[model samples]
Target: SVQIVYKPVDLSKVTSKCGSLGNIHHKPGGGQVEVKSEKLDFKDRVQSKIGSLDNITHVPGGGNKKIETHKLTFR
Candidate 1:
């Protein structure tokens, strides 16, 4: 039983550009996309290594921002 569905994209309009001291808006919808599942055998799923590295804090949203690492692949 495996079912994963994710559809989040409204981080308060999402906008960034801080090189000349301008542009950086976020905080509006409180984005959310969390899905966790763990239970592998068979030698750790053949040394698992498909996708892992998630961190989406305040994305496109405002305030308490910084920390948008992505790489949640799975097949």
Candidate 2:
């Protein structure tokens, strides 16, 4: 099994800064995100890269989200 908890603050994934904006306050709680793979290798690779077993998504109390995008091939 494998998972990727996405932090919205990982600005590296952000591509633009043209938002009609104001100060953004990050709540200490509330978010939802998850990615999963059944392939042991795929799971191993992703978990190893991100180095975390905690929630990556924003959903409260763990959403356990999952995906089978790479179990059949290298992602």
Candidate 3:
């Protein structure tokens, strides 16, 4: 058996995804309302901002995903 020398997490495989917005909610209804507990679709918006480390690489979506103004209004 090998000794556990390193941390449990893979630093190389990790993104800048820690402490990200976990839950957000909104209520848009007529004459009635509802509560929601959910993680928004824009959760991974920050990941797109990280460009390639070098000048030569292949990025998903041609790396053209522009996130101009993405804010998480968590409740």
Candidate 4:
């Protein structure tokens, strides 16, 4: 059985545009969150910010695996 865990990352420790995206949470529960941006270039900003984290990728399920932002989805 594939057991999953989620432990939220401390938002205070996060320094980047991600802070504005929303509350930063992680695996023992929530894995990802959606952020709305009026600017068309927001995608770049997200990649630069979130991509820096270990095993974190702006492209959800970037490794061609299932994701956690919404329901279980294959990216």
Q: Please, what are the lDDT tens digits per residue for candidate 2 over residues 11-32?
A: 3332333435445454443556
How accurate locally is residue 13 in candidate 1, as Cα lDDT from 0 to 100? 47
Off by over 4 Å in 3: 1-18, 30-75
lDDT of 1 by residue, 3-63 (tens): 9887666556445554444365645446664666799446443443333345354433334
Span of ten consecutive residues with least summed lDDT in model 4: 11-20
Give me the candidate number with maximum TM-score: 1
State the displacement of the C-alpha of residue 75, model 2, in Å, after optimal TM-score superposition: 61
For each candidate in the order shown, give its overall lDDT on alpha carbons. 0.53, 0.44, 0.41, 0.45
Clashing pairs in 3: none
Better of 2 and 4 by lDDT: 4
Count clashing pairs, candidate 3. 0
Q: Which regions in candidate 4 have their CA more than 4 angstroms from the true location?
A: 1-32, 39-47, 55-75
Error of 3 at 19 (Å): 2.2
Q: What's the residue-level lDDT of 70 in candidate 3?
A: 40
- Worst lDDT run of 10 residues, candidate 3, spans 48-57
Model 3, range 1-75, lDDT digits (tens) per residue?
544343344334323433444354544333544455587666454543232233443334233333345454533
